[PDB]
Structure formats: C-alpha cells, structure tokens
Amino acid sequence: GVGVSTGSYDNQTHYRFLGDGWVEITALATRLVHLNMPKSENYCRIRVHNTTDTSVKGNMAKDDAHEQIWTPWSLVDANAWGVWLQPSDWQYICNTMSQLNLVSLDQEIFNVVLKTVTEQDLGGQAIKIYNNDLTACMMVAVDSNNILPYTPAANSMETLGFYPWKPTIASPYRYYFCVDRDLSVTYENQEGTVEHNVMGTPKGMNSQFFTIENTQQITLLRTGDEFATGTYYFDTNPVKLTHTWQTNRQLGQPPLLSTFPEADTDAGTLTAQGSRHGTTQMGVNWVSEAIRTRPAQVGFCQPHNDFEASRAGPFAAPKVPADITQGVDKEANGSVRYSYGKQHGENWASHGPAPERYTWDETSFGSGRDTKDGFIQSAPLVVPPPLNGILTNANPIGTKNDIHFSNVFNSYGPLTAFSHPSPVYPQGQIWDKELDLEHKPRLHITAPFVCKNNAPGQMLVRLGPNLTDQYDPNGATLSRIVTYGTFFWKGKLTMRAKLRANTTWNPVYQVSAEDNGNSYMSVTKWLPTATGNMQSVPLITRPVARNTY
Amino acid sequence: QFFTIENTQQITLLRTGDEFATGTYYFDTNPVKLTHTWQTNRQLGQPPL
Structure with missing residues (x-):
C-alpha cells in the first residue's frame, strides 16, 4: 500500500560482551538520502584536460587530466567511520578495546517517496508546487558480484553524512576510462617548451564500457516498496587499537x-x-x-615526493604512514592530509567555500624516520668519519642542491617490520576491495580492513525516467518531467572487539574530553552551537601503547 | 658437487621391443590469468x- 511505513529508524550502537573479553559491537546507521534526477540519463565519457595549470612550466603535480565514464546512477556508499559510530563511541572503542574486527554488513532501503515539482505564480512570480507522485519508481541495483569498477565514495569525500539528524546526498557513480596521457617533466620557469601535453585516443585492448543495466539485476522500488540486501559476511584481518613506541634502538x-x-x-x-x-x-x-645487532629494522626509509609516470601521467608513489619525529616532516613519512566537506565534519558556520584540512599524524612512534639526521658512512667503518667518507643530509644528489640522499634512498628490505596505519575517525574508510593483480600489495593506505575475498556490494540508486506526452525515440530533446525523491537508508555493521589488559603500573594515555579553551579536545567542538552548527574533528585511534618486542 | 646419473638414478634399459612409461605427475601450481590489466596508479578509485 501507499499509506503505510515499511521500515523503522534505528541509529544506536549496542555492546554485547560475549564472554572472556570479547565485545560484539553492532553499529546501526540510518539516514534520509535525497535523490535528484540525473543531469542527463545517457552514459557519456568526458575527457578532463586542464591546459591552464599543466601548460605552465613546472606543474606536473597540478595535473588531474583523465577520462571518465559518467553513468546516470547515484551511489549510496556508507564506507566511513562517522556514518556508524558517534564520537562518544570512538572513545569507548579506543580507550577500552585492544583489537577491532569487521564481522558483517546488511543494508536496507525503505520509506521511498518520489514527487514532482510544478510551477504556479500566486504573486506574479513563479513558485514551486511539490506535487506527490504515487506511480513513479526508483531503481536500486546493488552490485554484489563486483563486475563494475570499484569507486569508494570516501575518496572524493562523498559518503553519507555523519550527523544522523540531517538529510544526505547520494554521490553520482562514475569510473575511469583508460586513455593515455603523456606529460614531460619540467622544472620551474625553465627556458624551453613543455613539448608533451597530449591526451591519447581510446586503445582497443584496454577499453571497458560498463552499463549498470546489462550487468545488474535492478529492483524497481515504488512508494510502498522496500529493498534489503542480505548480510555480507566479512573476511578481513583485525587491526590493533594499541600504538607501538619501540624504535630500532630500543629492541632487546x-x-x-x-x-x-x-x-x-x-x-x-x-x-x-x-x-x-x-x-x-x-x-x-x-x-x-x-x-x-637488532632482530629487525622497524621503520623503512621510503623515497618521499617522487612522481612516477606510466601511460597515464605522473602520480605520487604512496608512502606508508609513519610518525613525524621532532624535526617534523609530515611529507617524508607520508602523513595523510584530508579535505573533508561540510557534511563530513566541517564547522557549519564556516561561510567560506574552502574545505577544512587536517594532516593526520600517525601514532606509531617506532617506525618513524628523521630525514635530516640520517647518514651513510663508507664500507670500512671509521669513527669519526672524514668529509669524503660520509653521506649526510646536506650534500647534493645530482646538480640540484635541494635533492639530498633521503629522497632517493629506498631502504625497504627483507627484515622491515612495521605496523599498519590506524583507522582514522570520522572521515576514514572502513574497507577496500583487494586489487585483482597477480601479486598483491601488503596493505592499503586508505583502509584498515582490506577484504580478503570479495568487497561488499555497491548500492547504486537512480530515479526511473518520467516522460511527458511529447516523446520521440529518434533525435529528441528529452523533456522528462522534473522528479525527485527521498528514501531512508538503514545499514547495520557488526564488529567484534577485544577488551584491554591493564599490565603497566603508571596510568595509560586516554582520550579524555577537556574543558572549553584552546586545546584540541575541548568539548565545545562536539556540541552544537546557539544555532546548531556541529563540527566533527578527528580523534586519536590508538591511545594506549603496546610492547613491540 | 659431481653428480653421476648412474649412482643417483634407476636406469631402464630399453631394447627395440621395449617401452617405458612414467606415471602421472600431479602439478601443484597456481593459476595465471589470461586477462591483461590496464589500470595504472592514476586510475584507481x-x-x-
């Protein structure tokens, strides 16, 4: 029927201690997603090429030229930590737990309403009449077999909102088409030419056009219809919520x-x-x-700020995150910088168009590399070494002075033992599909829980096309009555965590919420203002330390 | 290491009317894929x- 509800709002998180220090966290999330009709309902690839930044000499890092198939489908992707847990729950599952693991995930769409807009004047100027629509449908094809490209919406910061009392937006689904980019490297104001800024035509071998219709089984949800995906059971590995402090000079x-x-x-x-x-x-x-002599090297020296180039233009090599050490190098250790929007934890009172940025300093203090205080001596060790018998971080590599040996030194060896980086609060990303390559990477620097077997299904939603009486399937104008809709989304993400074992004598570090002031943990942040402007800033994931060796 | 074939193997003397057959050796390898990859590092996500 049309005048009855087909679901229940539920947003709380349940802790279900199930014996010898094992918790069963069952996080529930529910939002009201606001689906609008697409710009056009045709699949179109749009090559992006910026010959306004890249044509300037020395802007290879300012290049975002690519090609994308733009599907007329919107994506409901709840793949961030702030969707499920409230900030008082990332304090309980960080101070008290010692290990987190993902167990299952099931999603549900209910209370679908679609409505059209019309125009009336009433004052001499047109206003909208939001007229109801009882026979239009909504198409909710979930992709459980993972045939389409994986576009995690926590990359463009396009996931669902982190405050449950706000309506969210569905992010439009688009993926990468494979064309060739050829950019020439150039330093700043070089007396020469760029000589290579060409974008390539589509190749025959690696060209994949994926329609959502020919690959998925679509469910047409009307006003009185619901949709439910079964429980996808995760097969990930547990991350630890205890940081390491022992460096290579504190082993044994x-x-x-x-x-x-x-x-x-x-x-x-x-x-x-x-x-x-x-x-x-x-x-x-x-x-x-x-x-x-120590058992194993703890942190490896990675070549920082290098830009590789292979058939798609220059891209930075992804560094494993690590601690900044006293000479602070947020780029030489790979500290991730965020650019989250206004529905993802910005101050709502920020009138500016710029996003809020945050450099995520990694808490693993052992595997960090001071780049300015590292050196390399000659093969017969003499102490103290002469001038030509040591390679410090003041000597130039090549002609250029600003490139020292720490930019080219890659000391990742067969006995490098590092911890995997922490789950970043709200604007993190919970899971990621493992790559389909024949030899797999050891980790992902975007998600703590890499799925070992299969990723959970991408939920793709769009509005069914509502047509006017004037319609021609030949060369047309696509009149298409102005429809929109809102639907409730409810997910349940089950987790499993192990409680802490207090072994030390001194009090351990805890993420306590301080008084109002200039501190980072003032309670005035996680509290609405006089007009209700919430902000969600990141929290420390691993407060308590653990013994590495 | 000096390896003689005589002192290490069990040799079969095949005459004109003789045959020889080795049993089925069962492999334990990993499957390679016959589909090439095209996504570079700037086309992930x-x-x-």
Missing part, C-alpha cells in the same frame, strides 16, 4: 651499566665500549647502541 | 566529480 636487552646514579639527577655510566660484549654488523672493536 |  639494554646494556648492563657498571655505575649507578647516586642522586636522582645524574645518569648511570655503562660499561666502556672497548671491553663490552654483544654483536655488531661492523668490523670495529667496540659495541655501541647504534651499531649493535 | 572514484574519479573526481
């Missing part, structure tokens, strides 16, 4: 000290380096903390 | 709206 037994401090100020001197035990990798006859 |  510390050296035994011969003298002890009398007062509480001075330090205890160790055994002298000449008559000291242990193993080293060098040939010198003294053991120190620096040249001592 | 959702394109910008």
Whole structure:
C-alpha cells in the first residue's frame, strides 16, 4: 500500500560482551538520502584536460587530466567511520578495546517517496508546487558480484553524512576510462617548451564500457516498496587499537651499566665500549647502541615526493604512514592530509567555500624516520668519519642542491617490520576491495580492513525516467518531467572487539574530553552551537601503547 | 658437487621391443590469468566529480 511505513529508524550502537573479553559491537546507521534526477540519463565519457595549470612550466603535480565514464546512477556508499559510530563511541572503542574486527554488513532501503515539482505564480512570480507522485519508481541495483569498477565514495569525500539528524546526498557513480596521457617533466620557469601535453585516443585492448543495466539485476522500488540486501559476511584481518613506541634502538636487552646514579639527577655510566660484549654488523672493536645487532629494522626509509609516470601521467608513489619525529616532516613519512566537506565534519558556520584540512599524524612512534639526521658512512667503518667518507643530509644528489640522499634512498628490505596505519575517525574508510593483480600489495593506505575475498556490494540508486506526452525515440530533446525523491537508508555493521589488559603500573594515555579553551579536545567542538552548527574533528585511534618486542 | 646419473638414478634399459612409461605427475601450481590489466596508479578509485 501507499499509506503505510515499511521500515523503522534505528541509529544506536549496542555492546554485547560475549564472554572472556570479547565485545560484539553492532553499529546501526540510518539516514534520509535525497535523490535528484540525473543531469542527463545517457552514459557519456568526458575527457578532463586542464591546459591552464599543466601548460605552465613546472606543474606536473597540478595535473588531474583523465577520462571518465559518467553513468546516470547515484551511489549510496556508507564506507566511513562517522556514518556508524558517534564520537562518544570512538572513545569507548579506543580507550577500552585492544583489537577491532569487521564481522558483517546488511543494508536496507525503505520509506521511498518520489514527487514532482510544478510551477504556479500566486504573486506574479513563479513558485514551486511539490506535487506527490504515487506511480513513479526508483531503481536500486546493488552490485554484489563486483563486475563494475570499484569507486569508494570516501575518496572524493562523498559518503553519507555523519550527523544522523540531517538529510544526505547520494554521490553520482562514475569510473575511469583508460586513455593515455603523456606529460614531460619540467622544472620551474625553465627556458624551453613543455613539448608533451597530449591526451591519447581510446586503445582497443584496454577499453571497458560498463552499463549498470546489462550487468545488474535492478529492483524497481515504488512508494510502498522496500529493498534489503542480505548480510555480507566479512573476511578481513583485525587491526590493533594499541600504538607501538619501540624504535630500532630500543629492541632487546639494554646494556648492563657498571655505575649507578647516586642522586636522582645524574645518569648511570655503562660499561666502556672497548671491553663490552654483544654483536655488531661492523668490523670495529667496540659495541655501541647504534651499531649493535637488532632482530629487525622497524621503520623503512621510503623515497618521499617522487612522481612516477606510466601511460597515464605522473602520480605520487604512496608512502606508508609513519610518525613525524621532532624535526617534523609530515611529507617524508607520508602523513595523510584530508579535505573533508561540510557534511563530513566541517564547522557549519564556516561561510567560506574552502574545505577544512587536517594532516593526520600517525601514532606509531617506532617506525618513524628523521630525514635530516640520517647518514651513510663508507664500507670500512671509521669513527669519526672524514668529509669524503660520509653521506649526510646536506650534500647534493645530482646538480640540484635541494635533492639530498633521503629522497632517493629506498631502504625497504627483507627484515622491515612495521605496523599498519590506524583507522582514522570520522572521515576514514572502513574497507577496500583487494586489487585483482597477480601479486598483491601488503596493505592499503586508505583502509584498515582490506577484504580478503570479495568487497561488499555497491548500492547504486537512480530515479526511473518520467516522460511527458511529447516523446520521440529518434533525435529528441528529452523533456522528462522534473522528479525527485527521498528514501531512508538503514545499514547495520557488526564488529567484534577485544577488551584491554591493564599490565603497566603508571596510568595509560586516554582520550579524555577537556574543558572549553584552546586545546584540541575541548568539548565545545562536539556540541552544537546557539544555532546548531556541529563540527566533527578527528580523534586519536590508538591511545594506549603496546610492547613491540 | 659431481653428480653421476648412474649412482643417483634407476636406469631402464630399453631394447627395440621395449617401452617405458612414467606415471602421472600431479602439478601443484597456481593459476595465471589470461586477462591483461590496464589500470595504472592514476586510475584507481572514484574519479573526481
């Protein structure tokens, strides 16, 4: 029927402690998605080419030239942390838990209403009459077999809103068509020419045009219809909610000290380096903390700010996130920078068109690399080394002075042991489909829970076409009565977490909410203002430390 | 390492009217795919709206 509701709003999160320190977190989310009719209902590829930034000398990193198949379908993708958990729940599943894992996910569309707009004047100027529509349909094809390209909407910050008392927008589905880009590298104001800014014609081998109709089984939802996807059972690996602090110089037994401090100020001197035990990798006859043999290297030196280029233009190599260490290098360790919009945790009172940005400093303190205080000596170790026997971070590589050896040094070896980066709160991304390549990467720098078998189904929604009486299937104008609709979406994401074991003597670090002021954790942020302007800023994911080795 | 074929293998002397047959060796390999990939690093994920 039309005058009856086919669902129930539910948004709370349930903790269901199920024995020996195992929690069953069952996060429920529900929003009111606002579907509008597409711009055009034709599939069209639009090549984007910016010869206003890229033609300037030295702007290879300012290049976003590509090609995209633009489907007339909108995508309901709840793949962020802020959709499911409220900010008081990322404080309970960070201070108290020690390990999180994904269990299942089931989604549901109900309370669909579609309505058209008409024009009337009433004052000499046209106003809208929002007339109801009881026979129009909504098409809700979910893609559970993963034939279409995977476009996670947490990349363009286009997921559902994080506040449950707001209507959200559905993000339009579009994917990448494969054309060739050829850009020449150029430094700043070089006396020359660009000489290569060509975009290629479609190749015959790697061309994939994917229609949603010929691949999916579409359900036509009317006003009194509901849709439900079955529980997709995850097969991911657990991330830990405890950060590591032990660097490579704090692994193993510390050296035994011969003298002890009398007062509480001075330090205890160790055994002298000449008559000291242990193993080293060098040939010198003294053991120190620096040249001592350790089980494994903890953080690897990655070549930072390098731009590779292969058949699609220059792109930056993705760095594994790491800690900035006291000389702070937010780019040399790969600290991710966010550009989230106004329905994803910006201050609503921000009148400006610019987004709010946040550089995510990684909490794993052990695997971090101070780039300015690293060096390379000669193969026979002499201490102290001469001028031509050490490669510091002040010598130039090549002709250019600003490129030192830490930009080209890739020290990822067969005994590099690092932790995978933390789940970023609200504007993170929960899962990601593993790539279909024959040899897979070790991690994804966009999602903690890489699905081992199959990704959950992309839910693609659009409005069925409403036509006027004047219609020609030959060369037409596509009149198409102005329709829109709103539908409720409800998802349930089940999680499973393990509680903490208090082993230390001192109090551990906790994400406490401080008083109002200039601190980062003032309670005035997670609280609506006098006109109701919420903001959601990121929270620390791994407060408590753990022992690496 | 000096490896003689005589001291390591069991040799079959085939005459004119003799045959030899090895049993079915069962492979334990991994499947390669006969579909090539085209997506580079600048064509992964959702394109910008």
